[PDB]
Amino acid sequence: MFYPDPFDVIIIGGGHAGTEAAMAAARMGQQTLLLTHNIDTLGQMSCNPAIGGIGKGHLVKEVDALGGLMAKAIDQAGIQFRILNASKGPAVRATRAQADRVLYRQAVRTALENQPNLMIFQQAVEDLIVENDRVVGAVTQMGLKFRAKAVVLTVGTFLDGKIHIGLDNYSGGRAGDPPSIPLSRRLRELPLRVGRLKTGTPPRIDARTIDFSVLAQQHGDNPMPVFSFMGNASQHPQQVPCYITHTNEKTHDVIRSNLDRSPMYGPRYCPSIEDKVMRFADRNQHQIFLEPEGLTSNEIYPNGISTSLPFDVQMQIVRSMQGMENAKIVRPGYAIEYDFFDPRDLKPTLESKFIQGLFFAGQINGTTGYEEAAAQGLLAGLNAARLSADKEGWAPARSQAYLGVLVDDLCTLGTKEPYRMFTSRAEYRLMLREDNADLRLTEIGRELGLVDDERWARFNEKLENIERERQRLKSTWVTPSAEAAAEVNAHLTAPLSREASGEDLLRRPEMTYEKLTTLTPFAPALTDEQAAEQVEIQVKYEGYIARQQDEIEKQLRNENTLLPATLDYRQVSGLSNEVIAKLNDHKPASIGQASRISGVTPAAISILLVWLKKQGMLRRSA
């Protein structure tokens, strides 16, 4: 029954969050154990085979900078690479890759399979062990049960999910996988609140039944970009293009005629295609993408045609488009409904506020997307391994990582939509960029021992480069009567009228970095342009960064002021009943987090501070 070796941390579920949690826990020198249903599914993509995008590439870069694997399994599995918002400011660009599925699966499995201090085990779980608000050990299906000092759950969408097609349904965790039914009941009996969500995916087409000779092609950028701060372009496999098609009035007529057979007729947008036509009935054209699932299989994923209509309607819609006159379907489209937990009963370190040692990550945190789970899993594993070693935990803030924004929003949003990350959703966009993620996370990774020697050496060299470039550009001066100033004045507007300097010379918006590096002064730029772009970003954004920094420094006291979960706001005088109910329901962790809740005003926080000072539950508030 009892396994004769105790472990530090146990992860239940090796999906997109469990793998990151296990890697982070094992790399931090703690004995790690990973339980999963079945192997060879590690790294499986059950949806659109794409990685990154607007708001998703930032999370990938954050995971990579702190010692992740998602950004390294994609450099050897991407079949198309593009940069989004390339023409705009560097703070908003993103990198999106159409990925070969098998290469990604194998990179993930092989990287995870050779990780020291970690062991994997193929078995389901059926219950957990808890006494005195402490979780110790998990129970498998055969009868064998383990013991550990910390447990992380990364079930995802397998918590008692049903597949829905048309008006019919059947049990299933996804296309071809079984459901984890009893664990749903076992977690439900625990004092938690559980709900249900539903999302769908379109069918798959056969590439040798589509006449691509009349379909428009689309390509990526000529210089293929990279995700990780370590690899280069020599690791990418061969490239393939994508095909673009459209719909026509016959498709809309068929959808409207057969709209009766649907469970519906809901997010604030339109995920399906019948929603696309009904919400906007005047539009008569839509864009559909056809992209290959890999360079060695002829299955095409259609993007933009997701629905929940029965099979006959699916076939008619597929067969009523240009280039799809005679098409075959290998995998029908379908939706799924799964359980989740409301993210208002766990600490910002992704630990349940009621149980000691229990952690949550992945889809069960009311989110969606591959990138929205890896960061949660990595942070959960980090905190779990810190706790098992009896040291203080860690959690990022809204001003240094998109993960901090994601956690804070999931804690104090209260909406019902699946959480999708967007660039504008964060208030510190101008500094929370992609190229500087390592510059603001790898030192923390090194302090907690998540970063090995190669990354440390690379970052030290890069920082030395940046500092030397800053100093040398600060060490130049020009005058209008300078011997070489004729050409300087020639190709620069507003010619020099006083002592000039490169740090001030570049302040003009029209000038660039490489142009200034090509000059009689301002000697040739350093060979590592990856470090060179940093100085350009800093000089262009110095004013806004300074304003935001002195802004952030002011709320630090409210960030530090903690509020214990045992607090009973009914014992506070001067606060309205609605505010008391709201604060009792949310149970924030800090006064600043409470202030971010909708419905609380500065009067409420002032009265709360007065009450805290009265009860002595605060050392000081300055």
Q: Please give the Cα distance from 165 to 174 (Å, whole number).
A: 12
| DSSP string over 438-482 | HHHHHHHHHHTT---HHHHHHHHHHHHHHHHHHHHHHT--B-TT-
The distance of closest approach from Cβ of residue 110 to its own copies in the complex, given in angstroms and rounded to an integer, is 5
CB-nearer residue toward its own copies: 114 or 471:
114
Tell whether residue 267 is among the known ligand binding residues.
Answer: yes
CB-nearer residue toward its own copies: 34 or 226:
34
Residue 329 touches which of its own copies, ligand FAD, none (CB < 5 to 8 A by kind)? its own copies
DSSP count for the chain of H helices, then E strands:
19, 23
Bridge partner list, 372: none
Tell whether residue 16 is among the known ligand binding residues.
Answer: yes
Residue 80 touches which of ligand FAD, its own copies, none (CB < 5 to 8 A by kind)? none
CA-based R_g, the chain, Å: 27
Tell whether residue 363 is among the known ligand binding residues.
Answer: yes
- Are 381 and 21 in contact by the 8 Å Cβ rule? The answer is yes
Nearest to 340 by CA among 194, 200, 198, 179: 194
The distance of closest approach from Cβ of residue 38 to ligand FAD in the complex, given in angstroms and rounded to an integer, is 6
Tell whether residue 15 is among the known ligand binding residues.
Answer: yes
Q: Please give the Cα distance from 345 to 411 (Å, whole number).
A: 8
CB-nearer residue toward its own copies: 37 or 246:
37
Please give the residue whose beta carbon sits closest to ligand FAD in the complex.
156
Lookup: tokens for 74: 């994609």
Tell whether residue 272 is among the known ligand binding residues.
Answer: yes
Q: Please give the Cα distance from 61 to 56 (Å, whole number).
A: 9
CB-nearer residue toward ligand FAD: 158 or 301:
158
Residue 156 touches which of ligand FAD, its own copies, none (CB < 5 to 8 A by kind)? ligand FAD
Residue 363 touches which of its own copies, ligand FAD, none (CB < 5 to 8 A by kind)? ligand FAD
Output phi, psi for 187, to 5 deg. -75, -30
Q: Please give the Cα distance from 528 to 239 (Å, whole number).
A: 26
Q: Please give the Cα distance from 599 to 584 (Å, whole number).
A: 13
The distance of closest approach from Cβ of residue 258 to ligand FAD in the complex, given in angstroms and rounded to an integer, is 21
Residue 331 touches which of its own copies, ligand FAD, none (CB < 5 to 8 A by kind)? its own copies
Per-residue CA distances from 454 to 65, 231, 308, 530 (Å):
12, 12, 49, 17
The three-class DSSP label of residue 53 is coil
The distance of closest approach from Cβ of residue 491 to ligand FAD in the complex, given in angstroms and rounded to an integer, is 48
Residue 199 touches which of ligand FAD, its own copies, none (CB < 5 to 8 A by kind)? ligand FAD
Tell whether residue 143 is among the known ligand binding residues.
Answer: no
Per-residue CA distances from 337 to 171, 287, 303, 573 (Å):
10, 27, 21, 44
- Are 426 and 405 in contact by the 8 Å Cβ rule? The answer is yes
* Contact positions vs ligand FAD (CB under 6 A): 12-18, 35-37, 41, 46-47, 124-125, 154-158, 174, 180, 183, 199-201, 336, 362-363, 368-370, 373
Per-residue CA distances from 571 to 564, 574, 614 (Å):
14, 10, 12
Nearest to 621 by CA among 555, 553, 557: 557
* Contact positions vs its own copies (CB under 8 A): 4, 37-41, 44, 102, 106, 109-110, 113-114, 116, 119-123, 141-144, 165-166, 168, 170, 175-178, 206, 208, 296-299, 310-311, 315, 328-332
- Are 502 and 522 in contact by the 8 Å Cβ rule? The answer is yes
Residue 17 touches which of its own copies, ligand FAD, none (CB < 5 to 8 A by kind)? ligand FAD
Tell whether residue 17 is among the known ligand binding residues.
Answer: yes
Residue type, 550: D
The distance of closest approach from Cβ of residue 364 to ligand FAD in the complex, given in angstroms and rounded to an integer, is 8
Tell whether residue 538 is among the known ligand binding residues.
Answer: no
| Angle CA 310–313–314, to nearest 5 | 85
Tell whether residue 276 is among the known ligand binding residues.
Answer: yes
Residue 15 touches which of its own copies, ligand FAD, none (CB < 5 to 8 A by kind)? ligand FAD
The distance of closest approach from Cβ of residue 363 to its own copies in the complex, given in angstroms and rounded to an integer, is 20
CB-nearer residue toward ligand FAD: 124 or 451:
124
Residue 142 touches which of its own copies, ligand FAD, none (CB < 5 to 8 A by kind)? its own copies
Tell whether residue 145 is among the known ligand binding residues.
Answer: no
Tell whether residue 37 is among the known ligand binding residues.
Answer: no
Q: Please give the Cα distance from 93 to 151 (Å, whole number).
A: 37
* Maximum Cα–Cα distance across the chain: 88
CB-nearer residue toward its own copies: 110 or 538:
110
Q: Please give the Cα distance from 412 to 504 (Å, whole number).
A: 43
- Are 528 and 465 in contact by the 8 Å Cβ rule? The answer is yes
Tell whether residue 134 is among the known ligand binding residues.
Answer: no
Residue 70 touches which of its own copies, ligand FAD, none (CB < 5 to 8 A by kind)? none
The distance of closest approach from Cβ of residue 256 to ligand FAD in the complex, given in angstroms and rounded to an integer, is 24
The distance of closest approach from Cβ of residue 514 to its own copies in the complex, given in angstroms and rounded to an integer, is 42
User: What residues are designated binding site for FAD?
Assistant: 13-18, 125, 180, 363
For the annotated binding site, the residues are 13-18, 125, 180, 266-280, 363
Going by the annotation, the residues of the binding site for NAD(+) are: 266-280
